RNA sequence: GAAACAGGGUCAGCUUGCCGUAGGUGGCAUCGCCCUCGUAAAA
């Protein structure tokens, strides 16, 4: 069920991650935190695009330390 | 080392007596005084 998760806000960084829906979720909780409007959002990347942003530095894994940013 | 948005908006509002009062008073001779004078003018 892990993802290459697009996380999309108004006229915001493409922020790209990696791991469960619920760690997307919480995720975008964290990016949500200050955020009163231009709430990042979550969408499923297609699997074929995957390959893709695999590989792109800018994306946060489903591995152990991709949850130390708090 | 081309193409590239800071953006799409968001009541400072809602409302609040400067008031209740508070002698300018009490009061204090304008005085005490002083010659319009001495004077020249019936052409």
Same mark, same amino acid.
Request: proline share 1%.
């Given at each position: 069920? /892990?993802? @290459? &998760?697009?996380? /999309? %806000? +108004?006229?915001? #960084?493409?922020? &790209? @991650?990696? $791991? /469960?829906? %619920? *760690?997307?979720?919480? +995720? ?11 709430? &990042? %959002? ?5 699997? %074929?695009? !995957?390959? #893709? +942003?695999? $590989?792109? *530095?800018?994306?946060?894994? $489903?591995?152990?330390? $991709? !949850? *130390? *940013? @708090?």
């Amino acid at each position: 069920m /892990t993802s @290459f &998760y697009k996380i /999309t %806000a +108004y006229n915001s #960084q493409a922020l &790209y @991650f990696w $791991g /469960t829906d %619920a *760690d997307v979720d919480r +995720y975008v909780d964290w990016l949500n935190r200050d955020r009163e409007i231009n709430v &990042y %959002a979550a969408e499923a990347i297609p699997e %074929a695009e !995957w390959a #893709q +942003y695999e $590989g792109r *530095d800018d994306v946060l894994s $489903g591995e152990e330390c $991709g !949850w *130390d *940013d @708090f």
